[PDB]
Design a binder for this molecule. Sequence first.
Ligand code: PRO
Ligand code: PRO
Lengths: 329, 329
Amino acid sequence: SKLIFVSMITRNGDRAPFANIENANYSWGTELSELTPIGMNQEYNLGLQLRKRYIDKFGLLPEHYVDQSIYVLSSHTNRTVVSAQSLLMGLYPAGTGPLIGDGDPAIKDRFQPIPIMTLSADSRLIQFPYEQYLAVLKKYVYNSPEWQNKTKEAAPNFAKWQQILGNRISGLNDVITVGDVLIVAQAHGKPLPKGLSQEDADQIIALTDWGLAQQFKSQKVSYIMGGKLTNRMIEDLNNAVNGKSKYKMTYYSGHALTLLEVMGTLGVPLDTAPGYASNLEMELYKDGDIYTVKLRYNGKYVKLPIMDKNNSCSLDALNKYMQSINEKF
Amino acid sequence: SKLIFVSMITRNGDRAPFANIENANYSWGTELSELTPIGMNQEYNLGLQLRKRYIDKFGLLPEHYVDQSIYVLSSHTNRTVVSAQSLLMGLYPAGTGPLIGDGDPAIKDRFQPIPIMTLSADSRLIQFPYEQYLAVLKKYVYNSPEWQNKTKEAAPNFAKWQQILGNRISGLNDVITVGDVLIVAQAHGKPLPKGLSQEDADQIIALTDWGLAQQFKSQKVSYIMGGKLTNRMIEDLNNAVNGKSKYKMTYYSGHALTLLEVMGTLGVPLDTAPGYASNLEMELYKDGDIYTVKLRYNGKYVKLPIMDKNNSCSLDALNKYMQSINEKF
Ligand code: PRO
Ligand code: PRO
C-alpha cells in the first residue's frame, strides 16, 4: 500500500494577541494579530518536517516542486497566508527552486514560489466569521450544563481577576479573551501583570484551554462550523481516486478553531486546544483497488470509531461515515 | 517634497500559453497558464529595481519589511500570486528577513514573508471575468470602425493562417488567440510552426499587439473594466493623506488587461500591449499641505491631460479629473 494523496490543515504559528491587557504595558515587536518571527520559524520547521515525512519517507511528493501538484487555500488573514508561505519554505526549501538558462537560479538562493489562494473574508469554510461564531456559542454552548458548571466553579475569581487585569471579566468568555493574551505573554517570556500570581495566570490559561476545547465536544456545534471543510477534505480524497483531480496534496491554512471544528465534526474532538502550528493530515493509501485512510494529528494517528486496530479504514467506510454525519445534522 | 505613498499594478511575468497551436508540438516545461522560471526571474528582478527606487533612492520604504506597510492584492490566478511573491523576493530579498533568538534567522537565508491576499475568482476588480470581457468586446469593440477596417486589411490572410496553424482563424479575435501562443514560442526560443514564415509570424504578433491596445483606445470600454480599480487606486492615495490608512504602498498583482484598462480609463491609453512584468505606479508626494501626484509606466512618467510640464498635478486635481470621468460614464 502506497501513499497517493494527503489533505492537511494547519493552525498558524505564534502571533501577537488580538487585544491588550489593560493593566499591563506589553510590547510585542509585531502588530496585533500578525505572525511573529517565532511563528514564521515554527511553520518553517513544520515544513522541513513534512518534507522528511512526505517527500523523503513516503515519496508522495518530489524533491523539486511540480506546478499544480499542491493546492493551497488560506483564510483571509495575514497570519494564515504568511504561515503557509513559511511552511512551504520548509517543504520546498531554498536550493530546490527553478533554474533558468544554464543552471542559473530563477530567484536568488533558488527560492521556490508556490501559489497560495485566499478565501474571501466572509467565507465560512476555514474561519467562521467571528460574530456568527459568538452567536453559535451564545445559543449552543454558554448554557450547556458543562459550561454552566465550570462557570460556577470559576466565578469566585472573576472580581479579583478583573481588578488585577482591568479588562472586564464576568464569565468564561471573558476569561478566554484575556487568557489568549497571557498565552502570548508566556510564549514571549514576558513578566506577569503586576498582582497576577503564576498560580492565577496558570488557572486563567487552563480555563482558556478547557473552554476552547469544550466548545467542540458538541458534534452539532462542530458541524455547524466545520461540516463544510470536513466534507471538502473527504471530497479531495475522492478526487484523487475518481480522476477528477491531479493534486498530490490539498493544504488548508487555518486557525485553532479550524482544527477543533474538523476533529469535532469527525466525532474525535480534541481534549486540549491546538497549540501553534498544530496540524492534521488525512492520508490516502492505494493497494490496487483497495483504498485506505489514516488520520494524523500533531504527529500521532487518531482512531475514528470506524477504524481498525491499525488506525485505518477504507475510503468507502469513511464516505459512509461522513454521509451519516451529514444526515444527522 | 517627499514621496509618501505609491500604488502599483504589475502584469505577471512570462507564462506558458493558455492553449495550443494545433499543428505544432511545443513543449513548455510548465503547465498551461502557469508562470515559468523566466517569469519568476522577471518579477524578481523588477522587485530588485523597485528596491533601488523606493527604498534606496526615495527612502519611502525601509530596508527591512515593516508589517502592515504594504497591502498586496492579487487576482485569483496562480501566475499573479507567484508573480507577486517573486517580486517581493526582490523588494525584500534574502538576508533582510526577521531574526529570532540571538540574531538567528526566523527562516533559513533570512527570507521575508509578506502576505498576499487574493480576490475571489468572480471579482471584476483586477481581472474582468473572461466571458464578460468577450461580451464587452463583441458589443463595443468588434464593430467599431477601426476594428472593421483592420479586419478587412488582415482578412486575406485568414485562410492561409488557418491551414498552416490548424486553429480556426476567421477574425481578428482568432488572430489574437494564436498570436499569444506565437509570443510565448518566441519568448522561449522555439522554432516556428512548419510553413509559418518569420514574416507571417511577425504579422500575426503585430496584429495581436495592435488588437489588445485597440480595445482600450475606447475610454468607455476601459471604464467598464477598469473604472473600479482606477477609483480604488486614487482612493488609496487619498487614504494616505486623510489618515484612513497607514500603508506606504498598495500593490495590485494583475494582467496585461489590468494595465490597459487603468491607463485607458485615465485617458492615456497604451500605444502597445504591455509586455511581461510591465508596471505602473501612482506616486504621491508631500510638501507641507501641498500634495502632488505623478504617474509612471514602465520606467517613464506619463502626462495626464491635467498635468503640468513636469508630469505632475495636485491630488485635488487628480480627484476632480477622476470625478469627471465617473460622471461621464
Ligand atoms: O479570535 C479572535 O479574537 C479574533 C477576532 C476575529 C477572529 N479572530
Ligand atoms: O486570456 C485568456 O485567454 C485566458 C482565459 C481566461 C482569462 N485568461
